[PDB]
């Protein structure tokens, strides 16, 4: 009834980084239910969206989506790296992104 989602809610945690310096070209995503790189490998290649509400109504609507994809795995606990057409704005470290299942292997 209520449920209509075909996606998997995750969090934008941070950017790729060392200590004291960062790479905003790459972001780190925490998927809910994923706990290891094995059992994250299912999600490589999948699409990611960050929705946000804007003010102007452009090509129809008020909301706007930044699209990207998952690339690989980060270290030992279910974190993945993601790459976007246009890197994320860093006001979102704590933001719910949505991973689709669109390019599937099933």
């Amino acid at each position: 009834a209520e449920s209509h989602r075909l996606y998997v809610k995750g969090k934008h945690l941070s950017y790729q980084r060392s200590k004291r310096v960062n790479n905003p070209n790459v972001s780190l995503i925490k998927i809910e239910g994923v706990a290891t790189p094995q059992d994250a490998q299912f999600y490589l290649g999948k699409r990611i969206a960050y929705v946000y509400r804007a003010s102007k109504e452009v090509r129809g609507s008020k909301i706007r989506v930044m699209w990207g994809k998952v690339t690989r795995t980060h270290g030992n606990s279910g974190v993945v790296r993601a790459t976007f057409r246009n890197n994320l704005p860093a006001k979102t470290f704590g933001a719910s992104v949505r991973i689709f299942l669109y390019p599937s292997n099933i």
Binding site: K11, L13, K30, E32, F93, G94, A95, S96
Partner: protein
Amino acid sequence: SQPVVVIDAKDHLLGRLASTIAKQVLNGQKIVVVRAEALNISGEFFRNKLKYHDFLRKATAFNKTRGPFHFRAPSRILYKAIRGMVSHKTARGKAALERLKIFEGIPPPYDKKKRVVVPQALRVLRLKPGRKYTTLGKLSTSVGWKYEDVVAKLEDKRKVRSAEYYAKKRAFTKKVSSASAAASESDVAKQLASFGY
């Protein structure tokens, strides 16, 4: 996974909570911590007392209203530990520490809402049996808290008002189990039992 989380802090260790809280709240989860006077901490009382009396010692000499504000309440000791773990000097630490709401005892809103427990900080699991541990209410009171004898007068009313609820619910569900156990001998359940329900 839930939008807001309510952490009972009894039998917990402080710095092993706060490293979970300070990350779960930096990643976007709202947390409240409740019954903080029942927290626990490693080490003997005199020792963890001196580790506070060597904090009260540290105040800005030329004007002590500028200096380290030594808070005496458990809700604020925990917040100190978390503020240290968070880059509170930016708009990310700031934004995180407004996702947090810490209390002593359990007020009404979080009274009728479920509570949870962080197992990787429970003194029970973590500490050796035989070690000495110190309780934050006794500590806060010894360093200048005031409202210990109030929380005990309120949380007890909470408890006796809750125990009756639990008994009500139990003496309701003991018959739900009977009327759904009286209905589990049909094909609808013999077929589900093969699916695993």
